[PDB]
mmCIF file of C-alpha atoms in Angstrom:
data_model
loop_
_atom_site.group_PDB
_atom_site.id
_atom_site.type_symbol
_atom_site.label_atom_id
_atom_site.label_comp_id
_atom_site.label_asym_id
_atom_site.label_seq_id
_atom_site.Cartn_x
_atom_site.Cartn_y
_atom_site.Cartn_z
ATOM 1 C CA UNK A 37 -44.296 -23.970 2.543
ATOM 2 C CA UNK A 38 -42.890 -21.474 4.562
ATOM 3 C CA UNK A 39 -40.825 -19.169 2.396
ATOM 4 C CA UNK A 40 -38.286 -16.987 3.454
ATOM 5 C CA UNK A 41 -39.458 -13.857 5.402
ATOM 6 C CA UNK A 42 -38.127 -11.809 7.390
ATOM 7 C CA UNK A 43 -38.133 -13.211 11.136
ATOM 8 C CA UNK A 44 -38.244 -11.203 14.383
ATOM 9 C CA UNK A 45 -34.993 -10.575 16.188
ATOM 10 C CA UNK A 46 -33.944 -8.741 19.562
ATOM 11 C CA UNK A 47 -32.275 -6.207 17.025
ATOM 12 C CA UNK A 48 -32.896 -2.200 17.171
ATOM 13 C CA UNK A 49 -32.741 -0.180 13.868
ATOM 14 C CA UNK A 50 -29.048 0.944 14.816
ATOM 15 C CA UNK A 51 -27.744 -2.665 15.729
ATOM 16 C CA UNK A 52 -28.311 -3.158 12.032
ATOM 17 C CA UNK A 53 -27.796 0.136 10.788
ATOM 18 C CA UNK A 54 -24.059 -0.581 12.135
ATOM 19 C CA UNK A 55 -23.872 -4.069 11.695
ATOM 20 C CA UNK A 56 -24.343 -3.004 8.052
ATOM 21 C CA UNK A 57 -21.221 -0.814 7.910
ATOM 22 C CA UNK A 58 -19.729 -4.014 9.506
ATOM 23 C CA UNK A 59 -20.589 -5.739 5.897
ATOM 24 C CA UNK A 60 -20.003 -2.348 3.900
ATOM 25 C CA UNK A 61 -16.719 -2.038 4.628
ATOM 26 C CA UNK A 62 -13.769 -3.890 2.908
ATOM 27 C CA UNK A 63 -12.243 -6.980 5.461
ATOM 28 C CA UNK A 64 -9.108 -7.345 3.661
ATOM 29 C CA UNK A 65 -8.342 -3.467 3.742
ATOM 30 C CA UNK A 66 -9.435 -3.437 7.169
ATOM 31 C CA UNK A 67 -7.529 -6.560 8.013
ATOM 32 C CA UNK A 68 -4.164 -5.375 6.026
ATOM 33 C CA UNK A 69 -4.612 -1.602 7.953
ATOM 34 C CA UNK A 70 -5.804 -3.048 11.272
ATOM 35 C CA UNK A 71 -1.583 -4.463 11.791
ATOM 36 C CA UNK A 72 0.055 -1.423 9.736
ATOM 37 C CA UNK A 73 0.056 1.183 12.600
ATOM 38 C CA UNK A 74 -1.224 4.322 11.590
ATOM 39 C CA UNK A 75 1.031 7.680 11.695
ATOM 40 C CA UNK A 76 0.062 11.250 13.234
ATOM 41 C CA UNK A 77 2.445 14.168 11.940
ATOM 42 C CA UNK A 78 1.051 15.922 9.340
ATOM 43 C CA UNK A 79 4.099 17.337 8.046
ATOM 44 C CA UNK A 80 6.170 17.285 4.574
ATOM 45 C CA UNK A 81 9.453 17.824 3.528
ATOM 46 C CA UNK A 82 9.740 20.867 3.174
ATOM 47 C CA UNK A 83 8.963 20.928 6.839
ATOM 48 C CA UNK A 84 12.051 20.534 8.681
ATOM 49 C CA UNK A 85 11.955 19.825 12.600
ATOM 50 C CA UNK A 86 8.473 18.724 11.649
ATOM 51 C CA UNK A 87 9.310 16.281 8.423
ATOM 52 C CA UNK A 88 11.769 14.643 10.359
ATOM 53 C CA UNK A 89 8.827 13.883 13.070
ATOM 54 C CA UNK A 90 6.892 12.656 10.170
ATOM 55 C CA UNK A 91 10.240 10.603 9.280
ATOM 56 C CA UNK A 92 10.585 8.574 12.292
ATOM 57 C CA UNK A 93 7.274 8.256 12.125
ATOM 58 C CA UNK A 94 7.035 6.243 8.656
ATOM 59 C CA UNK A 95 10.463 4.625 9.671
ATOM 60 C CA UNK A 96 8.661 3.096 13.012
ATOM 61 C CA UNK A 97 5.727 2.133 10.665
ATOM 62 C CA UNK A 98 7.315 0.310 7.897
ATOM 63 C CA UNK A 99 9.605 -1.736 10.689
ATOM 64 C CA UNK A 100 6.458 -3.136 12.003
ATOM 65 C CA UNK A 101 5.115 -3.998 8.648
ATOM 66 C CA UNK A 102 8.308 -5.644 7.279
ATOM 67 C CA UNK A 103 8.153 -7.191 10.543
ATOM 68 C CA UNK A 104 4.512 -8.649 10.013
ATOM 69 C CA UNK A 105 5.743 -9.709 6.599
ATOM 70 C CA UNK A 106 8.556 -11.946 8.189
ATOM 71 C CA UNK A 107 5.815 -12.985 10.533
ATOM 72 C CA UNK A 108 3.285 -14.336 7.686
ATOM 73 C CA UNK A 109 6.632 -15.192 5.715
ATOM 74 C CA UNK A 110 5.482 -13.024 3.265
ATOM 75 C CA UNK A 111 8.395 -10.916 3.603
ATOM 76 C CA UNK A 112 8.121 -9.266 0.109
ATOM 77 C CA UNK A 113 10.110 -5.926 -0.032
ATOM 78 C CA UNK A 114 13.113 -4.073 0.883
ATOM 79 C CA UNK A 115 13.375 -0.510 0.811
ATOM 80 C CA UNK A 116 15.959 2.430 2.183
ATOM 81 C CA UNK A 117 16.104 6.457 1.260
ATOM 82 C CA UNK A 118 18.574 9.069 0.987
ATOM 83 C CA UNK A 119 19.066 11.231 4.426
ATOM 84 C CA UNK A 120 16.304 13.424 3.787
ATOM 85 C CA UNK A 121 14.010 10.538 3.707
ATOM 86 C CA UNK A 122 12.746 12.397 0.615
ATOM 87 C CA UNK A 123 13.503 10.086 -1.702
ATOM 88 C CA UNK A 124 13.358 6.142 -1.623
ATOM 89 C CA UNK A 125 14.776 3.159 -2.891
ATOM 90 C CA UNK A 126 13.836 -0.843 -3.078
ATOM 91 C CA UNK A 127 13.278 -4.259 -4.478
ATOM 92 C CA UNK A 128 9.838 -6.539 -4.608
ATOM 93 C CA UNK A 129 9.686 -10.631 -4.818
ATOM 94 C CA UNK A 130 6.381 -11.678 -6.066
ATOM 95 C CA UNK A 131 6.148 -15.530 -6.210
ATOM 96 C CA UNK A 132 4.327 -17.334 -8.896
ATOM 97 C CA UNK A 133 4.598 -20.922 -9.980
ATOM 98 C CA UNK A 134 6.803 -21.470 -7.152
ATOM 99 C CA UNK A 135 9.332 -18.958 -9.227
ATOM 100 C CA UNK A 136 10.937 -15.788 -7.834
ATOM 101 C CA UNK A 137 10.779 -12.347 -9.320
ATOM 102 C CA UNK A 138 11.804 -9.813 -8.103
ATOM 103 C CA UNK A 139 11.358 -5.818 -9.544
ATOM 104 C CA UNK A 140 13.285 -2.972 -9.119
ATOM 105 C CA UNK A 141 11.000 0.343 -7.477
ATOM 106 C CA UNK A 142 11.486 3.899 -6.617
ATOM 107 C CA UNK A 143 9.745 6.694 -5.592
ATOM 108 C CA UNK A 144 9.989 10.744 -4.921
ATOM 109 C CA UNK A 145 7.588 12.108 -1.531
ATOM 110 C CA UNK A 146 6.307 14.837 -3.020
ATOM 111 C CA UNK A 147 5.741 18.458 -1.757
ATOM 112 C CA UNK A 148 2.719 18.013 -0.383
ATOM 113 C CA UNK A 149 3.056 14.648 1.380
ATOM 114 C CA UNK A 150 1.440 13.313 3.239
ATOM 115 C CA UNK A 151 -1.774 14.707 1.773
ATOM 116 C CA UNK A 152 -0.626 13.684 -2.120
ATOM 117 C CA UNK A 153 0.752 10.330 -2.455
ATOM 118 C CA UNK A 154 4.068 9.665 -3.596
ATOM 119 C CA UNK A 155 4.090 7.652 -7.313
ATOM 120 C CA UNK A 156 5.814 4.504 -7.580
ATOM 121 C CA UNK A 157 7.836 3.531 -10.615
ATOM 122 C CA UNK A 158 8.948 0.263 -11.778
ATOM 123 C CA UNK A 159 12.038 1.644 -14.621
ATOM 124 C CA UNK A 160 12.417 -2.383 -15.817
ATOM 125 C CA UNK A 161 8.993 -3.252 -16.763
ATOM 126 C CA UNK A 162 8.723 0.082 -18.568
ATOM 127 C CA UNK A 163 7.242 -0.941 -21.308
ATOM 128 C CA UNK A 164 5.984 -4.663 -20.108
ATOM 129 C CA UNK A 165 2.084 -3.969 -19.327
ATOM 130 C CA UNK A 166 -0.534 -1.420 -19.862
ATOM 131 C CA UNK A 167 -1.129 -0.142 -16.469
ATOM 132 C CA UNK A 168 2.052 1.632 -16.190
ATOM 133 C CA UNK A 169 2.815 5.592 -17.215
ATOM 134 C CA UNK A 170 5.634 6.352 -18.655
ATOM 135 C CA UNK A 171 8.970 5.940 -17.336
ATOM 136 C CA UNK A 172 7.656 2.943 -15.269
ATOM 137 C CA UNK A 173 5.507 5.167 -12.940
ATOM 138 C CA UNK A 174 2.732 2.325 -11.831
ATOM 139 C CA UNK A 175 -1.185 2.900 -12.164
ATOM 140 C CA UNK A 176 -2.937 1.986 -9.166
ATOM 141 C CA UNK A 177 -6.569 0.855 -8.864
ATOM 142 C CA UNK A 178 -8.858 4.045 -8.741
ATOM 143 C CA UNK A 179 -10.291 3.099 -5.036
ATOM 144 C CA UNK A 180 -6.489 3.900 -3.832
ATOM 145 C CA UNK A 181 -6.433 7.841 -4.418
ATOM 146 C CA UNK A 182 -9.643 8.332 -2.792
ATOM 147 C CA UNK A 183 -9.001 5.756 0.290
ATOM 148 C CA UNK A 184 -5.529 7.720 0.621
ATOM 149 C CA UNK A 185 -7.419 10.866 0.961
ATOM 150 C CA UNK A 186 -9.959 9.905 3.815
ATOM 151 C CA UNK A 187 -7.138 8.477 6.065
ATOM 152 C CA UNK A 188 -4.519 11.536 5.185
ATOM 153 C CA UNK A 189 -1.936 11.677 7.240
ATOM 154 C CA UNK A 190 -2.532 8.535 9.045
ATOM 155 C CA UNK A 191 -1.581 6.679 6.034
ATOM 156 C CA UNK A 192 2.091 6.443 5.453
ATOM 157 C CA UNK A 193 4.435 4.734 2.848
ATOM 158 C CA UNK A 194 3.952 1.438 4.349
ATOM 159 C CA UNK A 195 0.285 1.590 3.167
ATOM 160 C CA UNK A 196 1.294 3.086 -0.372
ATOM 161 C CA UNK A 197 2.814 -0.084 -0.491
ATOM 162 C CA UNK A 198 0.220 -2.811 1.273
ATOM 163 C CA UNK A 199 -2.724 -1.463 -0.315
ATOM 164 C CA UNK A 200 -0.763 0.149 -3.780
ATOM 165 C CA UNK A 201 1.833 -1.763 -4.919
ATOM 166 C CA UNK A 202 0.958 -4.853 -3.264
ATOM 167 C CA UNK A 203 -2.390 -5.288 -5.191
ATOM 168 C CA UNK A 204 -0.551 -4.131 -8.313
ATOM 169 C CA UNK A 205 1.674 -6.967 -8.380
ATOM 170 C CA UNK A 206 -0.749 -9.841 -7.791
ATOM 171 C CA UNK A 207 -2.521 -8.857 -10.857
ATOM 172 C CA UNK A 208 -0.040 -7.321 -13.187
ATOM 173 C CA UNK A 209 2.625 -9.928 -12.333
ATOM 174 C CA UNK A 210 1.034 -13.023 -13.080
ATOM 175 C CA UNK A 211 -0.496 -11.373 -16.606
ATOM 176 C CA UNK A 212 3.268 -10.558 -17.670
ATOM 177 C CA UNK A 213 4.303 -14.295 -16.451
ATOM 178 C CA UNK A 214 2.010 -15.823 -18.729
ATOM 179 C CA UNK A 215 2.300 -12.969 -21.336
ATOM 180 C CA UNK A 216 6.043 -13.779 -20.725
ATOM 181 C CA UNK A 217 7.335 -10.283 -20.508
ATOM 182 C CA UNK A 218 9.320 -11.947 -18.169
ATOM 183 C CA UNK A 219 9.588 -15.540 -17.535
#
């Protein structure tokens, strides 16, 4: 019986040596990323002429991502900010059991944005889970601080949201249905 061995291709050592980082990579972060478009400006808000680059920047990037959400009809956020764009404002509907909830969110841009994230808070379900700090300031997964940091500044506050919050929800949100936290 022939067992499996390893069978000749038309391969070299580097189309597989690639095609491996085309396996070792993540598909849905890729996939998410690949339709948020990426920003440029390396600037923060204590940057003037140059945060307000940075600003249209992240406006022009969370347009297209709202816009991909109404797309997919998984339009799942709304969100606005003072003038200064340095400090912001929103709502989030997660669906589950064909029920609506929806979660009030805000969060500061700090100094030294875009390089440091800016941390989310959820002020409601203060309280409601365990992977929350005080005040209602979410905890992310721990691949998120170090993926931010590798992209910095091409990442902008429509990926803190599609790869932060986003995740968040789908797992916290459906524990505090069922722990019923909120119904």
């Amino acid at each position: 019986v022939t067992e499996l061995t390893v069978e000749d291709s038309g391969e070299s050592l580097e189309d597989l040596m690639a095609k491996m980082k085309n396996m070792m990579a993540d598909e849905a972060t890729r996939r998410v990323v690949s339709e948020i478009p990426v920003l440029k400006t390396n600037a923060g808000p204590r940057d003037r002429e140059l945060w307000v680059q940075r600003l249209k920047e992240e406006y022009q990037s969370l347009i297209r991502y709202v816009e991909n959400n109404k797309n997919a009809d998984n339009d799942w956020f709304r969100l606005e900010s003072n003038k200064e764009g340095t400090r912001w404002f929103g709502k989030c509907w997660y669906i589950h059991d064909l029920l609506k909830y929806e979660f009030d969110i805000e969060f500061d841009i700090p100094i030294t944005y875009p390089t440091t994230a800016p941390e989310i808070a959820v002020p409601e379900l203060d309280g409601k889970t365990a992977k929350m700090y005080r005040g209602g300031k979410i905890c992310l997964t721990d691949h998120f601080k170090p993926l931010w940091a590798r992209n910095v500044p091409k990442f902008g506050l429509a990926h803190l949201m599609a790869l932060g919050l986003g995740p968040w929800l789908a797992v916290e949100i459906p524990d505090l249905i069922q722990k019923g936290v909120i119904q």
